[PDB]
Amino acid sequence: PYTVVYFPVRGRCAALRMLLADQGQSWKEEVVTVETWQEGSLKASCLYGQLPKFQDGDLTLYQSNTILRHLGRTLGLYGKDQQEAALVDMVNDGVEDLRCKYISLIYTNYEAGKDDYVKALPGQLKPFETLLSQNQGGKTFIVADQISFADYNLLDLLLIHEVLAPGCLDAFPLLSAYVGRLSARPKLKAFLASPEYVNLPINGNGKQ
């Protein structure tokens, strides 16, 4: 029923894959090689000339966050009412903002910019620790008491930053425990340990 069209990297598809695996959904991975991409035709047929491309039956979507929100609506991972839905969006938009900065560092100036990025990290992660502290003492999810699509995206964001800066979560007990807890969910834990996750690089230029 679902198809993910993407480069052979975790990148912007890692969160939605975790979501699908954790929700026990099945999907197909349509892999696009850089060589195939450079050919040009697939790219020209993409709405914004980029991937991921996602298919849910005959519904074709582009934009990683559009895919996350769509799955969030159809699978019931978007809060229980309008107010929670807004808080879920606020978290996801925050995650996207830091993901954009991470992507800029990785692909644009890893070598010269990493020191400053890492130095500024605590201030960028703190908002999520604060969100958790204001929600049942941080013992459940990022918004309210049920998992949402924002949790999967925030989880990915935290996992890749621990690779970029080992121990960056040591100063945030709530986020630390949160990562441990979500990573232990049976289906997610199995997915995270599997070759289809582990054998894909985080990014496409070999930096992490």
Ligand X SMILES: N[C@@H](CCC(=O)N[C@@H](CS)C(=O)NCC(=O)O)C(=O)O
Return the one option of ligand X, a copy of itself, none that residue 130 interacts with (CB less than 5 to 8 A, by type): a copy of itself
Find the DSSP H helices in the chain. 14-22, 34-39, 41-45, 64-74, 82-108, 110-133, 149-164, 173-183, 186-193, 195-198
**Single residue of 28, 34, 39, 49 touching a copy of itself by CB under 8 A:** 49
Min dist. Cβ of residue 48 to ligand X (A): 7
176 assigned to a ligand binding site: no
**Single residue of 3, 23, 63, 146 touching a copy of itself by CB under 8 A:** 63
Can you read off the two tokens belonging to residue 32? Answer: 């696009």
Are the C-beta atoms of residues 73 and 82 closer than 8 Å to each other? no
DSSP notation for 162-184: HHHSTTTTTT-HHHHHHHHHHHT
Pairing of strands 53-56, 2-6: antiparallel
Contact between 43 and ligand X per CB under 6 A: yes
The span from the CA of 49 to the CA of 31, in Å, is 16
Min dist. Cβ of residue 204 to a copy of itself (A): 18
3-state secondary structure of 73: helix
Bond into 52 cis (ω within 30): yes
Find where tokens 């925030």 sit.
Answer: 154
Report the site for ligand X in 45-84 (rule: CB under 6 A): 49-52, 63-65
**Single residue of 39, 97, 145, 196 touching ligand X by CB under 6 A:** 97
Report the site for a copy of itself in 143-182 (rule: CB under 8 A): none
Output 83 or 104, the one with its CB closest to ligand X: 104
The 76-115 contact track toward a copy of itself, x by CB under 8 A, reads ------xx-xx--xx--xx--x--x---------------
Pairing of strands 27-31, 2-6: parallel
Q: Which residues bind ligand X (CB under 6 A)?
A: 11-12, 43, 49-52, 63-65, 93, 97
Q: Which residues bind a copy of itself (CB under 8 A)?
A: 47-49, 59, 61-63, 65-66, 69-70, 73-74, 82-83, 85-86, 89-90, 93-94, 97, 100, 123, 127, 130-131
Give binding residues as ranges.
6, 12, 37, 43, 50-51, 63-64
